[model samples]
Target chain A: XMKXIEDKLXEIXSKXYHXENXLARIKXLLXER
Target chain B: XMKXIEDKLXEIXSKXYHXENXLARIKXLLXER
Candidate 1:
């Protein structure tokens, strides 16, 4: 179903944003040092 | 259409991977220094 696929995309986005946020913070911290 | 959405997702992945590759290389260079 399209709903399921939409849910999957949301899941992917959620995971991506979470990881991206963490990685970005680390990168920023390293760059600032 | 689902197909269009799928194409968009692919586009998103391609862009993300390309940028991620570039950033990862730069980060690697920085950390190695």
Candidate 2:
């Protein structure tokens, strides 16, 4: 038995979580560049 | 006694910061032109 679907959801969450955090930060900083 | 930084972070989730607001407004002004 494996949790492939749950793993996929978790992967999506992890990617979006990291991406959103840094994206917002860069949005605030990148304009200065 | 506590660190006060989280209060500022919460504002970005639900409100516009003065400086952030102006940055977007400048972009908005550009969008209009």
Among residues 3 or more apart in sequence or in different chains, the pairs in candidate 2 whose N, CA or C atoms overlap within 3 Å are none
Off by over 4 Å in 1: A28-33, B18-33
Task: Give the Cα-based TM-score of candidate 2 against the true structure.
Answer: 0.32
lDDT of 1 by residue, A1-33 (tens): 887776677677676667566666666756743
lDDT of 1: 0.66
Residue-level lDDT tens digits of model 2 in A1-33 = 135544454565465456455445656754543
Candidate 2 DockQ vs. native:
0.03
* TM-score (C-alpha) between model 1 and the true structure: 0.52
Q: Best by lDDT, which number?
A: 1
User: What DockQ results do all the predictions give, each relative to the true complex?
Assistant: 0.27, 0.03
If you score just chain A, what TM-score does every candidate get?
A: 0.51, 0.41
Deviation in Å, model 2, residue B12 alpha carbon? 22
Off by over 4 Å in 2: A30-33, B1-33
